Design a protein around this motif. Structure first.
Motif, PDB file in Angstrom:
ATOM      1  N   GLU B 227       0.817  -1.205   0.000  1.00  0.00           N
ATOM      2  CA  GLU B 227       0.000   0.000   0.000  1.00  0.00           C
ATOM      3  C   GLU B 227       0.854   1.259   0.000  1.00  0.00           C
ATOM      4  OE1 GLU B 227      -3.478  -0.144  -1.085  1.00  0.00           O
ATOM      5  OE2 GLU B 227      -2.278   1.660  -1.471  1.00  0.00           O
ATOM      6  N   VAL B 228       1.642   1.455  -1.082  1.00  0.00           N
ATOM      7  CA  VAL B 228       2.474   2.657  -1.303  1.00  0.00           C
ATOM      8  C   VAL B 228       1.665   3.938  -1.214  1.00  0.00           C
ATOM      9  CG1 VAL B 228       4.470   1.765  -2.548  1.00  0.00           C
ATOM     10  CG2 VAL B 228       2.385   2.307  -3.834  1.00  0.00           C
ATOM     11  N   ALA B 229       0.373   3.879  -1.575  1.00  0.00           N
ATOM     12  CA  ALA B 229      -0.511   5.027  -1.568  1.00  0.00           C
ATOM     13  C   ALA B 229      -0.656   5.668  -0.165  1.00  0.00           C
ATOM     14  CB  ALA B 229      -1.856   4.633  -2.131  1.00  0.00           C
ATOM     15  N   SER B 265       6.244  -2.823  -5.365  1.00  0.00           N
ATOM     16  CA  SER B 265       5.213  -2.000  -4.734  1.00  0.00           C
ATOM     17  C   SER B 265       3.855  -2.548  -5.054  1.00  0.00           C
ATOM     18  CB  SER B 265       5.301  -0.556  -5.237  1.00  0.00           C
ATOM     19  OG  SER B 265       6.392   0.146  -4.669  1.00  0.00           O
ATOM     20  N   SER B 266       2.893  -2.238  -4.193  1.00  0.00           N
ATOM     21  CA  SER B 266       1.522  -2.631  -4.434  1.00  0.00           C
ATOM     22  C   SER B 266       0.545  -1.578  -3.957  1.00  0.00           C
ATOM     23  CB  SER B 266       1.220  -4.000  -3.828  1.00  0.00           C
ATOM     24  OG  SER B 266       0.970  -3.923  -2.438  1.00  0.00           O
ATOM     25  N   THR B 267      -0.676  -1.585  -4.536  1.00  0.00           N
ATOM     26  CA  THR B 267      -1.777  -0.699  -4.138  1.00  0.00           C
ATOM     27  C   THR B 267      -3.127  -1.322  -4.458  1.00  0.00           C
ATOM     28  OG1 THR B 267      -2.597   1.557  -4.055  1.00  0.00           O
ATOM     29  CG2 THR B 267      -1.798   0.830  -6.222  1.00  0.00           C
ATOM     30  N   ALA B 268      -4.132  -1.081  -3.592  1.00  0.00           N
ATOM     31  CA  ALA B 268      -5.519  -1.513  -3.830  1.00  0.00           C
ATOM     32  C   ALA B 268      -6.367  -0.263  -4.159  1.00  0.00           C
ATOM     33  CB  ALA B 268      -6.078  -2.241  -2.627  1.00  0.00           C
ATOM     34  N   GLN B 269      -5.718   0.913  -4.082  1.00  0.00           N
ATOM     35  CA  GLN B 269      -6.298   2.224  -4.322  1.00  0.00           C
ATOM     36  C   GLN B 269      -5.925   2.768  -5.717  1.00  0.00           C
ATOM     37  OE1 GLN B 269      -4.876   4.090  -0.613  1.00  0.00           O
ATOM     38  NE2 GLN B 269      -6.924   3.902   0.251  1.00  0.00           N
ATOM     39  N   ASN B 270      -6.490   3.940  -6.097  1.00  0.00           N
ATOM     40  CA  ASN B 270      -6.231   4.631  -7.356  1.00  0.00           C
ATOM     41  C   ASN B 270      -5.127   5.689  -7.147  1.00  0.00           C
ATOM     42  OD1 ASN B 270      -6.402   5.729 -10.037  1.00  0.00           O
ATOM     43  ND2 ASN B 270      -8.231   6.910  -9.563  1.00  0.00           N
ATOM     44  N   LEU B 271      -3.881   5.310  -7.458  1.00  0.00           N
ATOM     45  CA  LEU B 271      -2.750   6.221  -7.327  1.00  0.00           C
ATOM     46  C   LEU B 271      -2.808   7.409  -8.297  1.00  0.00           C
ATOM     47  CD1 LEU B 271       0.305   4.078  -6.410  1.00  0.00           C
ATOM     48  CD2 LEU B 271      -0.495   6.111  -5.247  1.00  0.00           C
ATOM     49  N   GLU B 272      -3.308   7.158  -9.536  1.00  0.00           N
ATOM     50  CA  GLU B 272      -3.509   8.166 -10.581  1.00  0.00           C
ATOM     51  C   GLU B 272      -4.457   9.252 -10.084  1.00  0.00           C
ATOM     52  OE1 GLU B 272      -4.577   7.474 -14.633  1.00  0.00           O
ATOM     53  OE2 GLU B 272      -2.588   6.667 -15.129  1.00  0.00           O
ATOM     54  N   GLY B 273      -5.462   8.850  -9.287  1.00  0.00           N
ATOM     55  CA  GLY B 273      -6.432   9.765  -8.704  1.00  0.00           C
ATOM     56  C   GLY B 273      -5.775  10.677  -7.693  1.00  0.00           C
ATOM     57  N   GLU B 277      -5.050  14.651  -7.561  1.00  0.00           N
ATOM     58  CA  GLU B 277      -5.513  15.381  -6.372  1.00  0.00           C
ATOM     59  C   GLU B 277      -4.395  16.021  -5.522  1.00  0.00           C
ATOM     60  OE1 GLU B 277      -8.745  13.000  -4.385  1.00  0.00           O
ATOM     61  OE2 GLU B 277      -9.594  12.951  -6.421  1.00  0.00           O
ATOM     62  N   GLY B 278      -3.139  15.842  -5.919  1.00  0.00           N
ATOM     63  CA  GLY B 278      -1.983  16.444  -5.258  1.00  0.00           C
ATOM     64  C   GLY B 278      -1.441  15.749  -4.027  1.00  0.00           C
ATOM     65  N   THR B 279      -1.878  14.497  -3.777  1.00  0.00           N
ATOM     66  CA  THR B 279      -1.423  13.778  -2.590  1.00  0.00           C
ATOM     67  C   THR B 279      -0.256  12.802  -2.882  1.00  0.00           C
ATOM     68  OG1 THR B 279      -3.184  12.129  -2.724  1.00  0.00           O
ATOM     69  CG2 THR B 279      -3.658  14.162  -1.463  1.00  0.00           C
ATOM     70  N   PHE B 280      -0.056  12.410  -4.151  1.00  0.00           N
ATOM     71  CA  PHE B 280       1.035  11.495  -4.517  1.00  0.00           C
ATOM     72  C   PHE B 280       1.884  12.039  -5.659  1.00  0.00           C
ATOM     73  CE2 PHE B 280       2.591   7.247  -3.359  1.00  0.00           C
ATOM     74  CZ  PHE B 280       3.402   6.911  -4.425  1.00  0.00           C
TER      75      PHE B 280
END
Ligand SMILES: Nc1ncnc2c1ncn2[C@@H]1O[C@H](COP(=O)(O)OP(=O)(O)OP(=O)(O)O)[C@@H](O)[C@H]1O
Ligand SMILES: Nc1ncnc2c1ncn2[C@@H]1O[C@H](COP(=O)(O)OP(=O)(O)OP(=O)(O)O)[C@@H](O)[C@H]1O
Ligand SMILES: [Mg+2]
Ligand SMILES: [Mg+2]
Lengths: 428, 442
Positions: B227-229, B265-273, B277-280
């Motif tokens: 969960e890198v996000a 790395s892994s994610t279950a979330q939308n990193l592009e989003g 949105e300025g968080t990643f």
């Protein structure tokens, strides 16, 4: 196979020699002349292996081991004495290299030192994804003290407790605390062994080679998980092994003698089974030596909150789910359950809660509504499924209107007599 | 330990010496002079360790020839060779051929004590691991494609970005990649960012000034950022310096730490989003995403559910000792039709639940759908009750038509959009079903 090795030695000639050979193998070699340079190298980045000279010595070995309990240390000893070299092994060292050495010995020494350290880490890692005994209760303390007492003895154990209680863990705890702790811990689960393969699983086959449970358990502990699941046929076989400590392998004349400490366990009433003639009277007495009783969760309800806390922590280090707070009502209900499946059932339930609430805010509490009911359309074709639906739907509607067929019919969109006839046809 | 050790040498002075030292240590030592007498001892009972002379003049098989036979019969039985007066090139070939170590004549009594301890300790460790324990189950094209991807990207030095819903097997794909990688022997260190508070994130990864950060642990191996996000902005920049400079400073550290790590790395979330949105960080995401691997959702591979249920049942049997039950056609149909928001984790937990719940029932007795929890059963077609407010509020024809839609869609899900299989089961012909579906508008 390509680790980061720290070579600590007073002589630059050796520091270069050891570091050279190892680096030429594919290792990352770093070198130190004393304890201050060595501890600072560990401080730069910790190595995966250390080569430490005895005379700079055994004080540095302690500091490396105190700060890093999982870091293997191999000594650099002189030709004269393995006395100090062997002393260092006891002080915490893994192995030692003697001067003059061949490069090939050094390669193997480092390889073997790393392989072990890796295995020990592959153990700690595998252990963190899978399931000592939690419990602060008087029941748990009494059990821990019973384990502590019976484990150093060489006596045969009979662990009795309900299913999912902790019998196998008690067995393993007794093993870890006995003199056979470094010896095998072989398990035999009758419920999961087919009757046609039960003989092979316990004794093996003659000459790739199939080694039975008994032979494998030699010099260690053999665990007979739920003896009651063994048929009369194989109960006789177990007993015949108990008298002489010998057995024959399947399709073979050869008779094998083993030295195993037997630990048995049952969730069943064996005396009652002897009364029913479903279990052997002599076998039961032969196995029932030092009894140990694992209590039901119902007998230690006060531990349910600390066990939920523990399982919640366990599943976090497994799934990356942030442990949640269980509401007082859910907790009150959980504590009240009979737990037929005890701790195995408690853990599964705690996990189910982690999964279902995963998406939610960590501030939100786990509520009793989430607990399962204990705490066919999908298999049918279209016409059959439609018919069961209609039937159940009308039954549910009649009950909703408390039996007023006329009120039901009107709401449902039917005429009184038509509903009667439909109900009859559906078989109500 | 009190191990059963077999001592094989052609020299009586040596056999007796090795056997003597080790028996006085607490072991049970047995001796053999030739290959036939050695294989006779293995037949009598399998030892926990073997001490085998390299040469063996006067037998049917040389020491290296018998090494092969002992290993063939018992592949997990450690063997320590006995070689003499620095003719060790032969001994290293024996190690290469399967022997754990070699001890060379003349030797100290404590050297032989230590060689045996180590050989036995490794053997035990190897055994302990097998006892606790890897493969990705599935027969579906989705799964085969995933296994081919793992196979292709595991040898490379490239950073992996595994995306997939919760409990789909992203961690398993990371472990599978590591196991097939050039760093298979190196550490596999996991950081569960969703479990770590943002404030403590840098401490967990980089560590503190004099406490070893995950990166320092993962040196020469692979770092799995679960969960890198959830990486805070400061951590993002630091990870970025790790990818490019291969260095990092510890928390409250002026000092640089060099590392050789391969990040998965892994994610279950939308990193592009999050980038939108300025968080990643955009550049960090692209660097982390060199090789993307998309783990499919369980609802997108419902072909694999029956196989997975069998697999999970076998795995519970090896864990709990419960005899694997037969799942009823009802329960299997329900399990197959479900969306699985918690995917394979949730499927597994559910299989384990049925196993626990049916322990001690008649073994012939099928596991039935009614034993499954509400999140499974209540989201799928079933008989209504006075409590079902939505169904009860509808008259017969309306309730019946909704049911048809609910039922048909559920069967379609179960048969993964295969309208030919769906029709066969529900009792229709495939064009009759396509016409029925179009009519209902489902
Ligand atoms: N005191 C305890 N603290 C923490 N976890 C426990 C404790 N006792 C048992 N468990 C866990 O609960 C589960 C119970 O399985 P266990 O090894 O005890 O088998 P058992 O009691 O013999 O029953 P069965 O094997 O028939 O289900 C395991 O996951 C075990 O790790
Ligand atoms: N294809 C597969 N076949 C069999 N078992 C699998 C497969 N994929 C995953 N598993 C199992 O299902 C579960 C999924 O765990 P995993 O950690 O790999 O998933 P995830 O995507 O990383 O999500 P999370 O860790 O957040 O739950 C594990 O219990 C694992 O053993
Ligand atoms: Mg020196
Ligand atoms: Mg000889």
């Amino acid at each position: 196979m390509a680790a980061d090795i720290l070579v600590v030695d007073d002589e630059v000639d050796i520091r270069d020699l050891v570091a050279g050979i190892l680096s030429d193998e594919g290792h990352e070699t770093r070198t130190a002349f004393d304890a201050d340079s060595a501890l600072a190298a560990i401080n730069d980045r910790a190595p995966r292996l250390v080569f430490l000279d005895i005379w700079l010595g055994l004080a540095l070995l302690d500091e490396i081991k105190k700060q890093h309990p999982e870091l293997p240390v191999v000594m650099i000893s002189g030709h004269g004495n393995i006395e100090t070299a062997v002393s260092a092994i006891r002080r915490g060292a893994y192995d030692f290299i003697e001067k003059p050495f061949k490069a090939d010995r050094l390669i193997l020494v480092a390889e073997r030192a790393l392989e072990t350290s890796k295995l020990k880490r592959e153990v700690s890692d595998l252990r963190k994804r899978t399931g000592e005994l939690v419990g602060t209760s008087l029941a748990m303390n009494q059990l821990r003290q019973t384990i502590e007492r019976v484990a150093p003895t060489n006596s045969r154990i009979m662990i009795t407790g309900p299913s999912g209680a902790g019998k196998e863990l008690v067995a393993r705890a007794i093993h870890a605390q006995s003199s056979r702790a470094n010896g095998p811990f072989v398990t035999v689960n009758a419920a999961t062994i087919t009757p046609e393969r039960m003989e092979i699983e316990l004794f093996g086959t003659e000459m790739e080679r199939k080694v039975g449970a008994l032979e494998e358990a030699h010099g260690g502990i053999l665990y007979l998980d739920e003896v009651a699941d063994m048929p009369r046929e194989t109960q006789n076989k177990i007993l015949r092994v108990l008298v002489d400590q010998q057995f024959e392998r399947v399709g073979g004349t050869k008779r094998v003698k083993v030295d195993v400490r037997i630990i048995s366990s049952t969730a069943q009433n064996l005396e009652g089974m002897i009364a029913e003639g479903t279990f052997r009277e002599d076998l039961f007495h032969r196995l029932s030596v030092v009894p140990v009783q694992v209590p039901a969760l119902a007998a230690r309800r006060e531990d349910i909150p600390s066990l939920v806390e523990f399982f919640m922590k366990q599943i976090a280090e497994q799934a990356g789910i942030k442990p949640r707070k269980i509401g007082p009502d859910a907790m009150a209900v959980l504590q009240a359950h009979s737990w037929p499946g005890n701790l195995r059932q408690l853990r599964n339930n705690v996990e189910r809660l982690m999964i279902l609430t995963r998406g939610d805010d960590p501030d939100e509490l786990v509520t009793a509504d989430l607990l399962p009911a204990e705490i066919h359309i999908m298999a049918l074709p279209l016409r059959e499924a439609r018919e069961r639906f209609e039937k159940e739907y009308l039954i549910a509607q009649i009950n909703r209107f408390g039996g007023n067929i006329s009120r039901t019919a009107e709401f449902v969109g039917m005429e009184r007599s038509a509903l009667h006839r439909k109900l009859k046809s559906l078989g109500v």
